[PDB]
């Protein structure tokens, strides 16, 4: 009947809404570090750096 792939398939407006939230997840991070009133961040690693 359906596709017999062993992975995962998502069609329609599901991925069309997921790619915007994937791009907005990156833009909402770097929005606080733009311009002369922007502020720096902290990038802490698992090893402690």
């Amino acid at each position: 009947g359906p596709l017999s792939v062993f992975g995962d398939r998502s069609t329609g407006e599901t991925i069309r809404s997921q790619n915007v939230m994937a791009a907005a997840s990156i833009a909402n991070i770097v929005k606080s570090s733009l311009g002369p009133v922007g502020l720096d961040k902290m990038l802490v690693d698992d090893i402690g750096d």
Binding site: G1, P2, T11, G12, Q18, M21, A22, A24, S25, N28
Partner: protein, 535 residues
Amino acid sequence: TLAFDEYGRPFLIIKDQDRKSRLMGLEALKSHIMAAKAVANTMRTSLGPNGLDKMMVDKDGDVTVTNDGATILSMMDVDHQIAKLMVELSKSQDDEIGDGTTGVVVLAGALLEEAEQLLDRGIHPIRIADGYEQAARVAIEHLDKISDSVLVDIKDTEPLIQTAKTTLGSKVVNSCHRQMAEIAVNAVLTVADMERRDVDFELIKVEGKVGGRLEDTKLIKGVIVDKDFSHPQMPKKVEDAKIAILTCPFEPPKPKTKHKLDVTSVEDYKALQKYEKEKFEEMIQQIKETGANLAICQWGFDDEANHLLLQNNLPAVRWVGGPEIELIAIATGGRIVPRFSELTAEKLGFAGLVQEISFGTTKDKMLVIEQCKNSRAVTIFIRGGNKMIIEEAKRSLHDALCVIRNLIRDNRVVYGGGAAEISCALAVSQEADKCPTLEQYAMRAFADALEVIPMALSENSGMNPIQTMTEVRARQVKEMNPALGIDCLHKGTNDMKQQHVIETLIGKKQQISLATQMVRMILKIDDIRKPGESE
């Protein structure tokens, strides 16, 4: 993303959303058709007189071989909500008419298979559903063209027998195809109220006992109960029975409240012995003063009352059921008496040969009522070689009792064997061009799905579907359309009027009406919100 927001917060809408299943897509309609076609392909092989039966096993290990479409889909463990609606579709045909429970599932799966190719062309699913309503309306009006019956329930039982042979021809009762067909005709006409056109199936008792053969099934005018003569020396044959039906146990009268009767002296204890000794002589004499020679009691008997039955020559049965004695008072014309003091000669029942019959080596000894006087209650005694052939004959003959009931509700008939489906398919194709504005493709998908039922009869009979259907459909256009179908041994010609394949009008009228509305509820759905695992 799912279960997380773009700001890092957890995104939870409903509870346990990770173990949910939701499909809107374009395959949500495709999953409903592939689940419904597999039910229709299962029921396709059990259609017609050459339809092969199915073996159903219950959860307890009991095996029942069924052929009717109502009991097949009901005894499944299908956990699919689209196929569960096909179970209630075959149940709705059994509750209303009760003859086309197999054909209403193949027709519903045929409308969804033709709608699959219409869905890929870009047609809206409600536009197909609105096109099926305008196409099924033509099939209802065309089915009422040729319809006539001459049943008078006096001597013209010949249209009634040939109507029941169409229903019993597909079951396993074809060895008794003439004997058992006449049983279901006379069982309805003796209990039906022709002034109201109402038939009550509570008056038709269907009992079964293993032993004998299928040819030993007789229509017993009366009642058949388990006889429980408390005395083993009771006479087992009454020639003329004045039946005294009572609902009081043969005992001293016990009240319904708490009494705690007090005994003080020895004169009160000797009064206890004379009270019960005169009570058992009063309950026996009040039956003999009415002239009765047979008693029926719902409750038990006392040991002191058992020997008083033999001294007065009064046979009596013990521990009869609730609705069983309700059938005795109608078959014998008597009245059910609450007490013993209200017994009279007018409340007695009349019966002829009252006897018990032992079946082989068992100890059942069922009641056989041969003679009666204007009874309104009959009992069919189904015998067979095993319990598989009896429980199926209880389901096969019940479909034969329903098609006679539908003739009293509506005295119009059609001709089966695929003759009515080909004639209705030509009516939709003629009105598809008047006018082919929007719903031209939806009406032609209805006419191509109406031809699945006669081409399934050609497949089960060993013929070719597209070769036999093209010959029958072309002969109805070149001349005026007769009752032209098919058969298994084909009986020579293909004329259904000569082969006496007669079906009810309202049977096929509800086959097209219920399958169209069930298709509309499974086409007008674009989401599934089923859960995941059980726990």
